[PDB]
């Protein structure tokens, strides 16, 4: 129920690793954002200097978040597709953090990964449909926007349109073709809600990586776990705390009992946790083999 029991022996990465290898920790949920893909060459929104909010000057937006809003997209799709061309990677290589989630899957620990990312890197690392909720959709497929058509197009097709600087139009009806992303103002997919309803009844650990927990309703997922479920944040800075004026993360107050912040690069935090678990060699070998295979494409 809603008791605040303390299941970690200490509020440290070391405590989390011990908990993970106890009989009580069977079901792990990962919640991830753009911070897990910055080291794969895709900027986030909020990192100073490198984040997209500091690099939209030449688009002359009323404000930086407009290029990611559905109202603006529907009026003028060209800016978005121009930015898509600028950001599109020549190679899709998942990070150490992505492969740490692949290990959770392979060790039988991963109940679900909920991602805010649209970059497909979770799929490339080996997470399947049983494993993954793409809360904000994906670039992997695209669809015609006309309700009477809705023809689907693969990423190879969308990539060619983006690089040619031709606004993508449907071959069957000549309507706009839109990547399967959830823009600000659009509804999330049905499975986000069905997974959320089921998964958070029975979660033993919540692992939050590379997110500022500022987009809703995704950010509210932290509050859906049972009150005794430990929560580990791996991130460059603390995030998810309740605002002093406005369930939230409590790392540091006198009443802290289950939330742990490991501050640094997601890749470094995952490597550190892997090492405590006895998984460091497995993670190293996995990453090197998968990266080598990607480099060989």
């Amino acid at each position: 129920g809603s008791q605040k029991e303390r299941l970690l022996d200490e509020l440290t990465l070391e405590g989390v690793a011990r908990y993970m290898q106890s009989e009580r920790c069977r079901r792990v949920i990962c919640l991830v954002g753009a911070g897990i893909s910055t080291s794969a060459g895709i900027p986030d929104f909020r990192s100073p200097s490198t984040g997209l909010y500091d690099n939209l000057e030449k688009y002359h937006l009323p404000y930086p978040e407009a290029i990611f809003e559905i109202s603006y997209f529907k009026k003028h799709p060209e800016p978005f597709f121009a930015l898509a061309k600028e950001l599109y990677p020549g190679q899709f290589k998942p990070t150490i953090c992505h492969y740490f989630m692949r290990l959770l899957k392979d060790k039988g620990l991963l109940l679900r990964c909920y991602t805010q990312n649209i970059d497909t890197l979770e799929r490339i690392a080996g997470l399947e449909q049983e494993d993954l909720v793409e809360a904000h959709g994906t670039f992997y497929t695209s669809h015609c926007v006309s309700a009477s058509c809705r023809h689907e197009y693969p990423l190879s097709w969308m990539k060619e349109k983006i690089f040619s600087e031709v606004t993508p139009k449907c071959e069957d009806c000549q309507s706009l073709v839109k990547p399967d992303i959830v823009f600000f103002g659009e509804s999330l997919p049905a499975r986000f809600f069905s997974c959320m309803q089921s998964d958070f009844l029975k979660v033993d650990l919540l692992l939050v990586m590379g997110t500022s927990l500022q987009v809703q309703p995704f950010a509210s997922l932290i509050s859906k776990a049972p009150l005794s479920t430990p929560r580990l944040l791996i991130n460059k800075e603390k995030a998810g705390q309740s605002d002093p004026f406005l369930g939230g993360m409590d790392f540091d107050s006198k009443k802290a009992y289950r939330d742990v912040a490991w501050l640094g690069e997601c890749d470094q935090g995952c490597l550190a946790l892997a090492e405590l678990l006895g998984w460091k060699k497995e993670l190293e070998d996995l990453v090197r083999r998968e990266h080598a295979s990607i480099d060989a494409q």
């Binding site: 978040e65 904000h136 959830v182 103002g185 659009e186 509804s187 999330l188 809703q216 309703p217």
Partner: peptide
């Protein structure tokens, strides 16, 4: 619900 900032 909808995606909001």
């Amino acid at each position: 619900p909808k995606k909001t900032g």
